[PDB]
Amino acid sequence: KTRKCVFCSKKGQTIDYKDTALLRTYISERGKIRARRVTGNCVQHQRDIAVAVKNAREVALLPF
Amino acid sequence: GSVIKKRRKRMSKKKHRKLLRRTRVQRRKLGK
Amino acid sequence: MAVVTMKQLLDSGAHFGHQTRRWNPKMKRFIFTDRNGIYIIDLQQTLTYIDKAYEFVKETVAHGGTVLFVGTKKQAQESIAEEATRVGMPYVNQRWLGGMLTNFSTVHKRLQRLKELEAMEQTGGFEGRTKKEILMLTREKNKLERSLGGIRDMQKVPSAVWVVDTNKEHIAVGEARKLGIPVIAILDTNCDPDVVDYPIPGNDDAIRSAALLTKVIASAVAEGLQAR
Amino acid sequence: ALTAEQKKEILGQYGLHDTDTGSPEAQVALLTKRIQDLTEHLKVHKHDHHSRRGLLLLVGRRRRLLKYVAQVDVARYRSLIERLGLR
Amino acid sequence: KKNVPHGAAHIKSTFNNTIVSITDPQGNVIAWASSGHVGFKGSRKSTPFAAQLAAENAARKAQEHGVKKVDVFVKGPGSGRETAIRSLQAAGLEVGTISDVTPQPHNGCRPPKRRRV
Amino acid sequence: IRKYKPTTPGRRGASVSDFAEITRSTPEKSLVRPLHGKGGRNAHGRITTRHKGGGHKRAYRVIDFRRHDKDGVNAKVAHIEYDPNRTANIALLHYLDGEKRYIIAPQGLKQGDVIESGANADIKPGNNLPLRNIPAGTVIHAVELRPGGGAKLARSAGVSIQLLGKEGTYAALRMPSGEIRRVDVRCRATVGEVGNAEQSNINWGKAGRMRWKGKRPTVRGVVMNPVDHPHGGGEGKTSGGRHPVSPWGKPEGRTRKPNKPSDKLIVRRRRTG
Amino acid sequence: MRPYEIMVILDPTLDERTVAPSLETFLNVIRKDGGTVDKVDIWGRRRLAYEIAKHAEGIYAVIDVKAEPATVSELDRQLNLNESVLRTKVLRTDKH
RNA sequence: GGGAGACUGGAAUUCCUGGUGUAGCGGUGGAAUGCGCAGAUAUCAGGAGGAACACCGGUGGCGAAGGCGGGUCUCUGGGCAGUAACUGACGCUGAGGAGCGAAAGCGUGGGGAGCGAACAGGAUUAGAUACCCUGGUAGUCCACGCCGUAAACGGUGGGUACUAGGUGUGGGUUUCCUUGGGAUCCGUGCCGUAGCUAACGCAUUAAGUACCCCGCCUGGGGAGUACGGCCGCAAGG
Ligand SMILES: [Mg+2]
Ligand SMILES: [Mg+2]
Ligand SMILES: [Mg+2]
Ligand SMILES: [Mg+2]
Ligand SMILES: [Mg+2]
Ligand SMILES: [Mg+2]
Ligand SMILES: [Mg+2]
Ligand SMILES: [Mg+2]
Ligand SMILES: [Mg+2]
The missing domain is CATH 4.10.950.10 (Ribosomal protein L2, domain 3)
Incomplete structure (x- = not known):
């Protein structure tokens, strides 16, 4: 980890709000959203994550 | 810049507003 | 967030104190109880400030600031030399020079003077000049190297400053908080705690703890560098 | 914005010749269509207060294009005016 | 009276006093203590010794009812939490886990501006 | 609302209802019934309710408030007329069966739209539905004070009632006066605001x-x-x-x-x- | 038309055997008005992260439809009025 | 997080209901009003209403300026690059005029949880109509219009040509490796050439080199006040 990015660098990925497994590695332990530097992601994919995790929390797919 | 010149105009406007508040009634009913 | 626990800190011996005749009345908050006449520092107040400083450096990295290193000891010259070149941060090893942060119009001249010499070294001019001119440069190197060790590559006027051993380097931390720039440092039971903007509980006479502290303070910049 | 097919057919209709865009008459027709399409949305969202600025900018651009067309030639100007029903 | 083998102690600590209340896993409180109830008044209610003595009194009242296993939950910031936990575990009770439960208002209600002193 | 100009002393700042949403001007002669004023005098003839005197005679315009029958039979609105006896306009429905009736014409009820009473009807302003089928937290009006007793709640203009969480054989309604009252769930309600x-x-x-x-x-x-x-x-x-x-x-x-x-x-x- | 995705969280008291027919009864309107492809994925007995209308578990369903805004809005309204379903969410699979 | 419209959800404050539960709860540099003993505070469950959307979230994005932070959908403005096929001077400014114009205030229609002008009390002071605490009507909020004043500060008018660089960031394009780096074009920070600048300072985003246009300044008070007029329900400009 800590590379350029997993989405902006690998060139293949998809940010899906239903991907609770993938969003668990990005949400904090308590349930909050981790910072952008710790994840090392471009601004676009960071906002995509943010909105996906927000949709998950809204549909009750995460502990908020 | 300095605050002296600003507070001077502030006090001037405050005194003007106080006079206007005091004289409001002298034109309130004379206006209506 | 969090990067370490108290288990790894207990092994470093960061709960020791000094004699009871060299303390200050305003350092009785971190103490819990007197046992055999030695002072102890709480542990719950360590991880909080550690994470606070970590996030502050994480933010200042993106803002355009980094952390520095300062010191005046002449026994741990190796601990502050190996980890420095890894990230490329400033540091002082032998001689704590005067006027490096508060004065910026003077160090830039010596930086260019040293750059000129390091660039001309590639030519190898030894015969064109007299023996005295070459012999002087040998002692000049020993005179100029014991004061500046990492101030050559900063060139960025960072927005975060870290100080260590405030008891002896009070002038450093004293001038750090001058311009209001965020200041961080570790405090002792015989110094002033209000001088640092973000204190970090930690002993000043523990190399095992100082190494880990410097490592975790320098890794914050690499965290943002590898991402940028 | 305007759909690609709608813009293409509008240009083919009000174009001086095949493969013609950005001409005076074409630009005037595009602006008129844009205003006619935006008036319906404004009639609902009258409290926008932001799209009105773009509306005014487009109207000013159309007026400037019409002024230029009139300065160049009057016959073309009057023909476009009577064909689009403006003023 | 009643028996409660496992319970939980909620400690609401603020800048004025600390209230520690033991309760069954259902929610029916059994015993509780407060610095003011211990005897302290005014600013003395904020000292750590007051919270420690209140926690000790609560532990004694719980042992009177026969409670041994007691988890601990704490409210938002406030002095006396760690001292109360220490006193509870020292008075002959199982400390168990420590799950902090603090209300986190995400900009819900506008609080006062600031205390000028 | 249309404001009269200050032409005469009586029209200084007077206003009148815009009368919008009204299509026809005359009622249905088949549904209109007679009624004569009483001047506030009871059977004894003595003035009981004061301030009741000479007023323009009005019609009744029979309005059905039960709607128990014609569950599956749909119905569309025909016209929107005025009613003196009511402080709101009324709507004329052309039921598929053939008969016509009157309704309080809740707000947002345009012309041409179709309504459907019964239990399986869709929740939408203009259709009657039982409280058992009406979800909680909705807005209703003119349900009744008793099963099959007749709508007698929230009939004024721009008025309605909020249905809270129902439980068992009773549902809670927040009358426009802020009063919370329980009423059995078997009551037939009307979705939408007046x-x-x-x-x-x-x-x-x-x-x-x-x-x-x-x-x-x-x-x-x-x-x-x-x-x-x-x-x-x-x-x-x-x-x-x-x-x-x-x-x-x-x-x-x-x-x-x-x-x-x-x-x-x-x-x-x-x-x- | 435009592509759209519809996530649905139903009541745990129901059964997967009646979940799919219930979703088809609602997609009747789409197939009779829009006539679009139908891909309905279902997975039941999934525990939620917190209480949802006095329930700890539920059944999730995902549908994809290339229909009109009015059609998707009508479907969302029908699902919100129905009681057998608890929660609904409409997303636009497009880049925007 | 460009704007308007519709739908939707979590935390948290307050109230009420069904349990548990005591004689204190709140609060200050120290205290007292007040709230409880007529079951306080506090904990479990449920219901109600009004606002805002922690964490992502910042010298990072948009807008001409105000200003724009939860999620879904309809409409829509504006910006950069490549392809340069399209007309070829249509480029820029703008007296009056028109629109937008933070917050507060005003008319009408609703609600009102927290905070809170005024107002009641408590405390200090020789004297406190304030700084502190307890309640709190307007307001803060939604719907239709006025009010046009802010440090509406970058105290920097609008468009273009030119004047060493280093260091960051966001944006979409190609060459060199084969993830790594340079150039190209726009916004946004810092250090610094010449130059400008009374100094502070600006310095490729000029306050420099020069062109086009509008407004304003020609000593401080009087006074941004007086009369008349302009619009406005009023305050007021
Ligand atoms: Mg008399
Ligand atoms: Mg008498
Ligand atoms: Mg002007
Ligand atoms: Mg306002
Ligand atoms: Mg107050
Ligand atoms: Mg002005
Ligand atoms: Mg500078
Ligand atoms: Mg005048
Ligand atoms: Mg004036």
């Missing part, structure tokens, strides 16, 4: 307008004589000489229904302010 909400702000301007509606003047008891009103006349402008009291000696108190009535359904009385 129309003509723009009314109630109509400045009548002159006394003749209010008199046309059969509203006679109201004389204050202060100026009356001690033998007529408790607030004796006296010498000069007198505030009343005692506490406020009704003309029959009833003070301004609770005056509620007899204590311990059949009101076990009320869960929370309204709030004064």
Whole structure:
């Protein structure tokens, strides 16, 4: 980890709000959203994550 | 810049507003 | 967030104190109880400030600031030399020079003077000049190297400053908080705690703890560098 | 914005010749269509207060294009005016 | 009276006093203590010794009812939490886990501006 | 609302209902029924309800409030007319069966739209539905005070009731007066809010307008004589000489229904302010 | 038309055997008005992260439809009025 | 997080209901009003209403300026690059005029949880109509219009040509490796050439080199006040 990015660098990925497994590695332990530097992601994919995790929390797919 | 010149105009406007508040009634009913 | 626990800190011996005749009345908050006449520092107040400083450096990295290193000891010259070149941060090893942060119009001249010499070294001019001119440069190197060790590559006027051993380097931390720039440092039971903007509980006479502290303070910049 | 097919057919209709865009008459027709399409949305969202600025900018651009067309030639100007029903 | 083998102690600590209340896993409180109830008044209610003595009194009242296993939950910031936990575990009770439960208002209600002193 | 210009003293700042959403101007002669004013006099002939006098005669315009029958039979609106007896417009429905009826014409009810009563009807303003099928937290109006007893709640203009979480054989309704009341779930309700909400702000301007509606003047008891009103006349402008009291000696108190009535359904009385 | 995705969280008291027919009864309107492809994925007995209308578990369903805004809005309204379903969410699979 | 419209959800404050539960709860540099003993505070469950959307979230994005932070959908403004096929001077400014114009205030229609002008009390002071605490009507909020004043500060008018660089960031394009780096074009920070600048300072985003246009300044008070007029329900400009 800590590379350029997993989405902006690998060139293949998809940010899906239903991907609770993938969003668990990005949400904090308590349930909050981790910072952008710790994840090392471009601004676009960071906002995509943010909105996906927000949709998950809204549909009750995460502990908020 | 300095605050002296600003507070001077502030006090001037405050005194003007106080006079206007005091004289409001002298034109309130004379206006209506 | 969090990067370490108290288990790894207990092994470093960061709960020791000094004699009871060299303390200050305003350092009785971190103490819990007197046992055999030695002072102890709480542990719950360590991880909080550690994470606070970590996030502050994480933010200042993106803002355009980094952390520095300062010191005046002449026994741990190796601990502050190996980890420095890894990230490329400033540091002082032998001689704590005067006027490096508060004065910026003077160090830039010596930086260019040293750059000129390091660039001309590639030519190898030894015969064109007299023996005295070459012999002087040998002692000049020993005179100029014991004061500046990492101030050559900063060139960025960072927005975060870290100080260590405030008891002896009070002038450093004293001038750090001058311009209001965020200041961080570790405090002792015989110094002033209000001088640092973000204190970090930690002993000043523990190399095992100082190494880990410097490592975790320098890794914050690499965290943002590898991402940028 | 305007759909690609709608813009293409509008240009083919009000174009001086095949493969013609950005001409005076074409630009005037595009602006008129844009205003006619935006008036319906404004009639609902009258409290926008932001799209009105773009509306005014487009109207000013159309007026400037019409002024230029009139300065160049009057016959073309009057023909476009009577064909689009403006003023 | 009643028996409660496992319970939980909620400690609401603020800048004025600390209230520690033991309760069954259902929610029916059994015993509780407060610095003011211990005897302290005014600013003395904020000292750590007051919270420690209140926690000790609560532990004694719980042992009177026969409670041994007691988890601990704490409210938002406030002095006396760690001292109360220490006193509870020292008075002959199982400390168990420590799950902090603090209300986190995400900009819900506008609080006062600031205390000028 | 249309404001009259200050042409005459009577039209200084007077207003009138815009009368929008009205298509026809005459009622259905097959549904209209006769009715004559009473002037506030009961069978005995004595003036019982004061301030009731000469007003323009009106029609009844029979309105069905039960809607128990014609469950699966759909119906569309035909016209929107005015009704003096009601403080809101009414709607004429052309039922698929053939008969016509009248409804309070809730707000947002345009012309041409189709409505459908019954239990399997869709929740939408204009259709009747039982409380059992109406989800909680919705807005209704004119349901009833008793199963099959007739809609008698929230019939005024721009008024409605909020249905809270129902439980068992009782559902909670928050009347427009802020009073929460329980009512069995078997009651038939009507989704949507009453129309003509723009009314109630109509400045009548002159006394003749209010008199046309059969509203006679109201004389204050202060100026009356001690033998007529408790607030004796006296010498000069007198505030009343005692506490406020009704003309029959009833003070301004609770005056509620007899204590311990059949009101076990009320869960929370309204709030004064 | 435009592509759209519809996530649905139903009541745990129901059964997967009646979940799919219930979703088809609602997609009847789409197939009779829009006539679009139908891909309905279902997975039941999934525990939620917190209480949802006095329930700890539920059944999730995902549908994809290339229909009109009015059609998707009508479907969302029908699902919100129905009681057998608890929660609904409409997303636009497009880049925007 | 460009704007308007519709739908939707979590935390948290307050109230109420069904349990548990005591004689204190709140609060200050120290205290007292007040709230409880007529079951306080506090904990479990449920219901109600009004606002805002922690964490992502910042010298990072948009807008001409105000200003724009939860999620879904309809409409829509504006910006950069490549392809340069399209007309070829249509480029820029703008007296009056028109629109937008933070917050507060005003008319009407609703609600009102927290905070809170005024107002009641408590405390200090020789004297406290304030700084501190307890309640709190307008307001803060939604719907239709006025009010046009802010440090509406970058105290920097609008468009273009030119004047060493280093260091960051966001944006979409190609060459060199084969993830790594340079150039190209726009916004946004810092250090610094010449130059400008009374100094502070600006310095490729000029306050420099020069062109086009509008407004304003020619000593401080009087006074941004007086009369008349302009619009406005009023305050007021
Ligand atoms: Mg009498
Ligand atoms: Mg008299
Ligand atoms: Mg002008
Ligand atoms: Mg306002
Ligand atoms: Mg106050
Ligand atoms: Mg001005
Ligand atoms: Mg500078
Ligand atoms: Mg005048
Ligand atoms: Mg004036």
